[model samples]
Target: AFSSEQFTTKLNTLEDSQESISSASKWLLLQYRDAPKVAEMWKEYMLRPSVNTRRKLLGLYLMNHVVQQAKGQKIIQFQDSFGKVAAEVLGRINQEFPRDLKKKLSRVVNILKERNIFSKQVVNDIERSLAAALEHH
Candidate 1:
């Protein structure tokens, strides 16, 4: 299991660690499918971190999870409500995080891209939302 801090630090630095991130992300998606409680477990696990870091980790995890699930054929068919909720939550996170943290944000986005977890459509949506969020801030 990947810690939120590890993910945040490496991703924030924009390291070429796609293989690891992709593998972990795929595992996480699979786990989410097998165990619906995994997300809650992650939330509890993230509580061990600092408040700010906890929020960031949770945000990154959730964004990736939603996009990943959306990319699945079976998952997507049952994902209409989830997509709506994910979009709203993603938008809120984009609006909430500061410009100084963009590297971290981009890291999350890039990891999803590296994993082929997010569709071109969803990536574009996220990018636009992020840009708009920053511009407004």
Candidate 2:
């Protein structure tokens, strides 16, 4: 019953409240489950250069949640978008190399693999990127 507008509004309100953010995230994911618009919002939020790291991370979690919910359901329409966001998140992890962030990225990669969301080549590309990034730090 939650609209994208409401989701966006809740995201803004819950920006600084970690606990509230998780609940709002669940609501948003549930409201937009299996919807391409969820991917649309994920792309928008994840790609926003102005947003802080916490918000971006929350976006990643929500994106993961949506993908998980869509498992066993058709999700071809969201594949490319999700891939783009995942790559971006990976790039962020590469740039920062924070252990916690790396763990989160790993989980995302695993989810993508488990759900057969990304192509083998794309998954390989992500693994290569992570390896390359790890070598530098």
Candidate 3:
């Protein structure tokens, strides 16, 4: 009975450090079959006003690493699931945070594009929204 709340809580506890980020991401890889459900739950978790920007950033890191790993394994569903909300989630993350955070978000989007993990159109669309913020940074 591994519920979505419980799973996200596990990731929450694994926050703030790269070691934890890797461990948290490993957990997601193990649960890749639950991608659609987890992505939806994560979107809600990430957008909560009670959740701070740093935590959301950590989640984004987790997402980037996991997708990279998933790419090598040729997992498409998880990538597809996450791709759907990527622009919206990333836009909000970039908008809600400072310039430095925009750099971080932009890097993830670029990596996905470079690695050919997400669609060019999706990545391009995301880039379109972040274009201005990406300028001075």
Candidate 4:
């Protein structure tokens, strides 16, 4: 974990470079689409971030998806941790943050969820189908 001074500096730097950081974050997210590790990576980052930092990071990540398309033209894959976190966060943003702007993110998260078109059950079904196909082949 970064010391408070380090964290403060980092937060200031992030604010100064918000656009570039978000762009790079989006690129990393696209590269790891469908990979659970991407979500894990973000979770780790969030765990160490300050309250303000986490809020900004999540907002930027979610808002960016409104225009940027991933490899499959999707916002996020359902099984991806990022999708799960985004949904879970936005699902209760009003309760958690109590901000009107955060509430707007609920719709954005919902859009991503809809675009993914899969739940854990759906991913399980796909895995089973793949197994059956392999057995048949």
Candidate 5:
């Protein structure tokens, strides 16, 4: 059983490519399945401004898993972190306006909605933002 600090160190040292990040993130999630720090790390990866769309999409996938795993655990911090990541990813979607990436965002939003992780208004806002962005492009 690794401490949260050890997991953080390992995560920081992993390669930044989508493959490496995605594998390492999955490992971290498995290793710290019950820890809020895992979700926090996912949020960090997803929110990074420099991350490419592919990597961001991978990060979002990992976040979706963590959010589902943490459901019913009453971890408010993880939920809050997920909300922040979702909002950041939506901003990226609006900025990039890529069809595939937007589709991925829609998938994530649907997962969050099904799990009842975010409020109805928050989900609606994300959907509307993506819709508006898609229309302009």
Candidate 6:
């Protein structure tokens, strides 16, 4: 397996484009299916203090593709890995990340919730908090 630094760098530098999503999602599922390791690395990059939100958002989109494709392939590793971090990561993304992805990721979160990748209650709380956050902002 590659080092965590390598994976984080790979994620950090991925292009912000639709074309990159499926390719990278397949690449990850094939080469890096170690659930916890992948999940931890992704979490680190998403929360990296100096990383740009664009890159972070791109990483999120990549993950969304990964989970959906994994579901299609009947692979649960990515979902299991992601579910562990979903509440914390998605909640933070919606709360502290930029507003550009407000509705976009909201849809993604809803999809993941319906897929049972995580608890509905978790996303429900996130939605409530997000609604309150919108009011405050």
**TM-scores for every predicted model:** 0.45, 0.63, 0.85, 0.46, 0.61, 0.78
In model 5, which runs have C-alpha deviations exceeding 4 angstroms? Answer: 1-49, 94-97, 135-137
Could you tell me the TM-score of candidate 1? Answer: 0.45
For model 2 the local lDDT of residue 94 reads 44
lDDT (Cα atoms) of all candidates against the true structure: 0.49, 0.61, 0.77, 0.44, 0.59, 0.71
* Candidate ranking (lDDT, best to worst): 3, 6, 2, 5, 1, 4
Span of ten consecutive residues with least summed lDDT in model 2: 28-37
Q: Candidate 2 on 9-120: residue-level lDDT in tens?
A: 6555555455665676557545434355666675575556765666666666665655565454554545665675566565664455467766765676687777687788
What value does the lDDT take at residue 115 in candidate 5? 81
Candidate 1 Cα errors over 4 Å, as ranges: 1-53, 62-87
User: What is the TM-score of candidate 6?
Assistant: 0.78
The positional error of residue 87 in candidate 1, measured at the CA in angstroms, is 4.3
What lDDT would candidate 1 get against the real structure?
0.49
TM-score, prediction 5:
0.61
Stronger candidate by lDDT (3 vs 6): 3
Worst 10 residues of 1 by lDDT: 77-86
Clash count (model 3, backbone only): 0
| Model 5 clashing-pair count | 0
Compose the digit string of candidate 6's lDDT tens values, residues 5-71.
6567677678877777776777776643577778877876677677777777788888777777776
**How would you encode candidate 3's per-residue C-alpha lDDT over 13-122 as one tens digit per residue?**
65688798888788788877887887787777777787788888888888878877998787988777787777767776787888787777767667776778788767
Q: Comparing 5 and 6 by TM-score, which wins?
A: 6
TM-score of decoy 3: 0.85
**RMSD (Å) of each candidate, 1 decimal:** 7.6, 4.3, 3.2, 11.8, 5.1, 2.8
Model 4 stretches astray by more than 4 angstroms:
1-22, 47-49, 57-68, 71-79, 91-94, 117-137
Q: Give residue 103's error in model 3 in angstroms.
A: 1.9
Give a tens-digit lDDT track for model 5, residues 13-100. 5454657655655564454334545546655654566556665665555556655665645555556656755665666544574766
